[PDB]
Short mmCIF file of C-alpha atoms and ligand atoms in Angstrom, two decimals:
data_model
loop_
_atom_site.label_atom_id
_atom_site.label_comp_id
_atom_site.label_asym_id
_atom_site.label_seq_id
_atom_site.Cartn_x
_atom_site.Cartn_y
_atom_site.Cartn_z
CA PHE A 1 86.59 101.24 141.43
CA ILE A 2 85.59 97.66 142.27
CA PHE A 3 85.05 97.38 146.02
CA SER A 4 85.29 93.69 147.13
CA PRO A 5 85.09 92.21 150.76
CA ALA A 6 87.40 89.14 150.40
CA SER A 7 84.88 87.04 152.45
CA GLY A 8 81.71 87.46 150.29
CA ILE A 9 83.16 85.86 147.17
CA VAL A 10 83.39 82.40 148.81
CA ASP A 11 80.41 80.26 148.15
CA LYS A 12 79.06 76.92 149.21
CA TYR A 13 79.06 75.81 145.56
CA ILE A 14 82.10 74.09 144.22
CA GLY A 15 84.44 76.49 142.39
CA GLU A 16 81.71 79.08 141.76
CA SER A 17 83.80 80.80 144.30
CA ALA A 18 86.75 80.92 141.87
CA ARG A 19 84.43 81.76 138.90
CA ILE A 20 83.57 85.09 140.43
CA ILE A 21 87.19 86.06 141.07
CA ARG A 22 88.33 85.48 137.39
CA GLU A 23 85.35 87.52 136.13
CA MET A 24 86.29 90.33 138.55
CA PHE A 25 89.67 90.89 136.72
CA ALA A 26 88.01 90.22 133.32
CA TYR A 27 85.53 93.04 134.06
CA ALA A 28 88.49 95.18 135.13
CA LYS A 29 90.43 94.78 131.94
CA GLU A 30 87.47 95.82 129.86
CA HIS A 31 86.79 99.07 131.89
CA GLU A 32 90.59 99.72 132.03
CA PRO A 33 92.00 101.63 133.91
CA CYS A 34 90.42 99.99 136.77
CA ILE A 35 91.18 99.20 140.49
CA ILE A 36 90.38 96.07 142.41
CA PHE A 37 90.24 96.66 146.12
CA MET A 38 90.18 93.69 148.48
CA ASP A 39 89.51 94.18 152.18
CA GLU A 40 90.80 91.76 154.82
CA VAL A 41 92.71 89.21 152.61
CA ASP A 42 93.46 87.02 155.67
CA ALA A 43 90.26 85.31 154.67
CA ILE A 44 91.31 83.75 151.40
CA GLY A 45 95.00 84.70 151.43
CA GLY A 46 95.56 82.60 154.65
CA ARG A 47 98.56 80.27 155.35
CA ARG A 48 99.10 77.17 153.20
CA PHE A 49 97.85 74.45 155.59
CA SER A 50 97.05 71.24 153.49
CA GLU A 51 96.36 69.36 156.81
CA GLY A 52 93.09 71.27 157.22
CA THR A 53 89.61 70.19 156.50
CA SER A 54 87.46 70.38 153.34
CA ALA A 55 86.49 73.98 154.16
CA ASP A 56 90.22 75.08 154.25
CA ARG A 57 91.23 73.08 151.25
CA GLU A 58 88.50 75.05 149.41
CA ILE A 59 90.33 78.22 150.19
CA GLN A 60 93.43 76.71 148.43
CA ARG A 61 91.39 76.43 145.19
CA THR A 62 90.34 80.12 145.17
CA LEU A 63 93.79 81.35 146.31
CA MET A 64 95.64 79.34 143.74
CA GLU A 65 93.53 81.00 140.95
CA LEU A 66 93.91 84.55 142.27
CA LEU A 67 97.73 84.06 142.39
CA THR A 68 97.86 83.05 138.72
CA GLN A 69 95.41 85.85 137.75
CA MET A 70 97.77 88.51 139.05
CA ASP A 71 100.83 87.11 137.25
CA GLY A 72 100.70 84.51 134.61
CA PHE A 73 101.30 84.64 130.93
CA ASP A 74 98.26 86.99 130.91
CA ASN A 75 99.64 90.40 131.64
CA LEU A 76 97.68 93.30 133.15
CA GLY A 77 97.57 96.54 131.31
CA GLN A 78 96.54 99.26 133.80
CA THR A 79 94.72 96.88 136.27
CA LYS A 80 95.95 97.78 139.74
CA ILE A 81 95.18 95.89 143.06
CA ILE A 82 95.25 97.42 146.42
CA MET A 83 94.96 94.76 149.11
CA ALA A 84 94.57 95.58 152.71
CA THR A 85 95.31 93.24 155.63
CA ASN A 86 95.48 93.38 159.31
CA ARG A 87 98.67 91.19 159.50
CA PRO A 88 101.19 90.42 156.58
CA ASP A 89 102.47 87.57 158.76
CA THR A 90 99.48 85.22 158.33
CA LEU A 91 99.22 85.84 154.57
CA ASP A 92 100.47 83.10 152.14
CA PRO A 93 104.22 83.33 151.33
CA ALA A 94 103.37 83.07 147.53
CA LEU A 95 101.11 86.15 147.69
CA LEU A 96 103.19 88.24 149.88
CA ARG A 97 106.13 87.35 147.61
CA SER B 1 88.18 59.17 122.84
CA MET B 2 86.90 62.09 120.71
CA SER B 3 83.94 64.50 120.54
CA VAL B 4 80.96 63.36 118.64
CA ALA B 5 77.48 64.71 117.93
CA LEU B 6 74.40 63.17 119.40
CA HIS B 7 70.76 63.66 118.52
CA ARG B 8 68.93 65.11 121.48
CA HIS B 9 65.70 63.07 121.49
CA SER B 10 66.99 59.58 121.12
CA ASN B 11 70.69 59.38 122.04
CA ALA B 12 72.37 58.13 118.75
CA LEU B 13 75.67 58.98 117.16
CA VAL B 14 74.25 60.84 114.10
CA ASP B 15 77.55 62.46 112.89
CA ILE B 16 81.12 63.08 114.07
CA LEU B 17 83.19 66.17 114.97
CA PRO B 18 86.97 66.71 114.29
CA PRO B 19 89.26 66.48 117.34
CA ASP B 20 89.77 70.30 117.32
CA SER B 21 86.21 71.13 118.22
CA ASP B 22 84.70 71.00 121.61
CA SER B 23 87.42 72.43 123.84
CA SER B 24 87.30 75.39 126.16
CA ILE B 25 91.05 75.74 125.66
CA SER B 26 92.92 76.57 122.55
CA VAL B 27 96.59 76.83 121.45
CA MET B 28 97.84 80.37 122.25
CA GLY B 29 100.95 81.86 120.97
CA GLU B 30 99.42 83.41 117.79
CA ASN B 31 100.35 86.78 119.27
CA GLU B 32 99.41 86.06 122.91
CA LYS B 33 102.79 84.67 123.91
CA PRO B 34 105.11 86.83 126.10
CA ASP B 35 108.14 88.45 124.76
CA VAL B 36 110.38 86.67 127.43
CA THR B 37 113.05 84.78 125.48
CA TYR B 38 116.15 82.95 126.89
CA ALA B 39 117.85 86.31 126.69
CA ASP B 40 115.39 88.04 129.06
CA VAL B 41 115.98 85.49 131.84
CA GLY B 42 119.28 86.33 133.64
CA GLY B 43 121.17 83.34 135.07
CA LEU B 44 120.21 79.91 136.38
CA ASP B 45 122.35 78.36 133.72
CA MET B 46 122.16 74.83 135.21
CA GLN B 47 118.31 75.10 135.27
CA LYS B 48 118.28 76.33 131.64
CA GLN B 49 120.42 73.49 130.24
CA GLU B 50 118.57 70.94 132.33
CA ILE B 51 115.11 72.09 131.30
CA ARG B 52 116.05 72.46 127.54
CA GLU B 53 117.27 68.83 127.64
CA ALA B 54 114.02 67.88 129.39
CA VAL B 55 111.54 69.56 127.05
CA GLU B 56 113.04 70.93 123.90
CA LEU B 57 115.58 68.20 123.11
CA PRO B 58 113.24 65.20 122.93
CA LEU B 59 111.30 66.86 120.13
CA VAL B 60 114.08 68.25 117.88
CA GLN B 61 116.23 65.05 118.17
CA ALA B 62 114.08 61.98 119.19
CA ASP B 63 116.47 59.82 117.21
CA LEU B 64 119.41 60.26 119.73
CA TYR B 65 117.44 59.01 122.78
CA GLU B 66 116.39 55.86 120.80
CA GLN B 67 120.01 55.32 119.67
CA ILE B 68 121.71 55.53 123.06
CA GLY B 69 118.81 53.71 124.47
CA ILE B 70 117.88 56.02 127.34
CA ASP B 71 114.49 56.75 128.68
CA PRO B 72 113.52 60.30 127.46
CA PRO B 73 112.17 62.67 130.27
CA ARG B 74 108.33 62.51 130.24
CA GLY B 75 106.54 64.80 132.77
CA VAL B 76 108.36 67.76 134.22
CA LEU B 77 107.88 68.91 137.76
CA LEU B 78 109.14 72.26 138.92
CA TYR B 79 109.62 72.67 142.70
CA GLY B 80 111.40 75.55 144.48
CA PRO B 81 110.30 78.39 146.71
CA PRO B 82 108.12 81.13 145.38
CA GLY B 83 109.90 83.89 143.57
CA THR B 84 112.69 81.97 141.75
CA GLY B 85 111.37 82.39 138.16
CA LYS B 86 109.92 78.97 137.65
CA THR B 87 107.11 80.05 135.33
CA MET B 88 109.52 82.51 133.45
CA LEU B 89 111.99 79.75 132.42
CA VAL B 90 108.99 77.94 130.77
CA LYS B 91 107.89 81.24 129.17
CA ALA B 92 111.26 81.10 127.30
CA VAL B 93 110.61 77.60 125.84
CA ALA B 94 107.09 78.62 124.80
CA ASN B 95 108.53 81.16 122.34
CA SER B 96 111.66 79.16 121.40
CA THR B 97 110.46 75.67 120.35
CA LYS B 98 107.91 76.86 117.96
CA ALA B 99 105.57 73.97 118.62
CA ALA B 100 102.15 74.00 120.09
CA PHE B 101 101.89 75.33 123.60
CA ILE B 102 98.56 75.13 125.30
CA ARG B 103 97.80 77.18 128.45
CA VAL B 104 95.77 75.97 131.32
CA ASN B 105 95.49 76.40 135.01
CA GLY B 106 94.36 73.90 137.72
CA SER B 107 91.22 75.88 138.27
CA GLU B 108 90.25 75.43 134.63
CA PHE B 109 89.65 71.80 135.73
CA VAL B 110 87.39 72.54 138.75
CA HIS B 111 83.82 73.41 137.85
CA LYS B 112 80.38 74.08 139.37
CA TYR B 113 78.75 71.04 137.75
CA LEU B 114 79.80 67.71 138.93
CA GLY B 115 82.08 65.49 136.84
CA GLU B 116 82.56 68.37 134.30
CA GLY B 117 86.17 68.64 135.72
CA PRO B 118 87.12 65.16 134.25
CA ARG B 119 85.52 66.01 130.86
CA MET B 120 88.09 68.95 130.55
CA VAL B 121 90.98 66.62 131.53
CA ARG B 122 90.17 64.45 128.44
CA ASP B 123 89.85 67.60 126.20
CA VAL B 124 93.29 69.09 126.87
CA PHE B 125 95.09 65.74 126.07
CA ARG B 126 93.10 65.02 122.92
CA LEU B 127 93.99 68.64 121.61
CA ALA B 128 97.64 68.17 122.51
CA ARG B 129 97.78 64.77 120.66
CA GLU B 130 96.26 66.33 117.45
CA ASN B 131 98.60 69.27 117.15
CA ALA B 132 101.53 67.11 118.53
CA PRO B 133 104.35 67.54 119.43
CA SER B 134 102.77 69.73 122.15
CA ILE B 135 103.64 71.19 125.53
CA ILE B 136 100.80 71.42 128.11
CA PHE B 137 101.60 73.73 131.07
CA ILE B 138 99.51 73.52 134.18
CA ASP B 139 100.56 76.73 135.92
CA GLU B 140 99.78 75.78 139.57
CA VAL B 141 98.75 72.15 139.90
CA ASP B 142 98.64 72.37 143.69
CA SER B 143 94.86 71.94 144.10
CA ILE B 144 94.68 68.81 141.87
CA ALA B 145 97.82 67.09 143.32
CA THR B 146 96.66 67.59 147.04
CA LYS B 147 97.86 64.62 149.18
CA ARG B 148 94.91 64.36 151.48
N1 ATP C 201 116.69 85.10 136.51
C1 ATP C 201 115.80 86.15 136.34
N2 ATP C 201 116.04 87.21 135.57
C2 ATP C 201 115.14 88.18 135.49
N3 ATP C 201 113.89 88.33 136.01
C3 ATP C 201 113.69 87.23 136.83
C4 ATP C 201 114.57 86.16 137.05
N4 ATP C 201 114.05 85.27 137.95
C5 ATP C 201 112.91 85.81 138.25
N5 ATP C 201 112.66 87.04 137.67
C6 ATP C 201 111.45 87.90 137.84
O1 ATP C 201 110.54 87.40 138.84
C7 ATP C 201 109.20 87.36 138.33
C8 ATP C 201 108.39 86.37 139.12
O2 ATP C 201 108.75 85.07 138.69
P1 ATP C 201 107.77 83.91 138.29
O3 ATP C 201 106.31 84.37 138.31
O4 ATP C 201 108.29 83.27 137.09
O5 ATP C 201 107.89 83.01 139.57
P2 ATP C 201 107.72 81.54 140.43
O6 ATP C 201 108.94 81.22 141.27
O7 ATP C 201 107.32 80.50 139.37
O8 ATP C 201 106.38 81.86 141.53
P3 ATP C 201 104.69 81.88 141.75
O9 ATP C 201 104.26 80.45 142.13
O10 ATP C 201 104.44 82.93 142.85
O11 ATP C 201 104.20 82.36 140.35
C9 ATP C 201 109.45 87.21 136.83
O12 ATP C 201 108.29 87.56 136.10
C10 ATP C 201 110.63 88.06 136.58
O13 ATP C 201 110.38 89.43 136.41
MG1 MG C 202 101.54 79.77 141.83
#
């Protein structure tokens, strides 16, 4: 049981923030069955923007990875994700999907 | 532009490496390709025909494009709302062509060290050229192609 605040995986450093997230699933696969639990995914699952600042555009780089990590050509065996949110309305349409 | 080996204490090109070495990426499909054929996809028959003529057809019959004298389709862009099966339609051609098919995300090309993003961009092209004809798929290219 991986317990993960969604707002402590974002660093200052440039795409370290995405490096952590890929590892998190790669750990999971290797300890399978495993569960990834993300609390408050308004943080990095926010709306699309792309008229924000540098800070918000950073969020796009980590979100875009996490979306592909869940479904790509890489399949998940018994890796299961429970996300929790206080509003499904301000989550990304691609995530919510 | 190719990888090459340098001697640490002087900076000199002391030998050369083949264009396969020095990539973080590799050609998958050895047994790592999905099972999703043309058959597995349901409809979108217009999108199928269109994308097969975009990607598959230039390779199998280059000769026809040259003959007729038409510009072959180069880069492919797939737009449409999320949840339409964009990625799945490309899954199909990854099995079907039986050429090289690379794999790559847009976050493979961002990195912690600076200017080590560009060095990957050069790597994926060089690898594609060697084991050509090749298809490179950048899954989500959103973060590279930002407009601001
Ligand atoms: N025509 C279809 N027949 C059968 N399954 C389909 C079809 N279209 C879509 N699906 C299903 O929807 C899934 C999600 O599609 P896919 O990941 O290819 O989407 P996308 O539109 O490229 O979005 P995202 O950017 O969120 O990945 C597929 O893996 C598949 O199960
Ligand atoms: Mg996506």
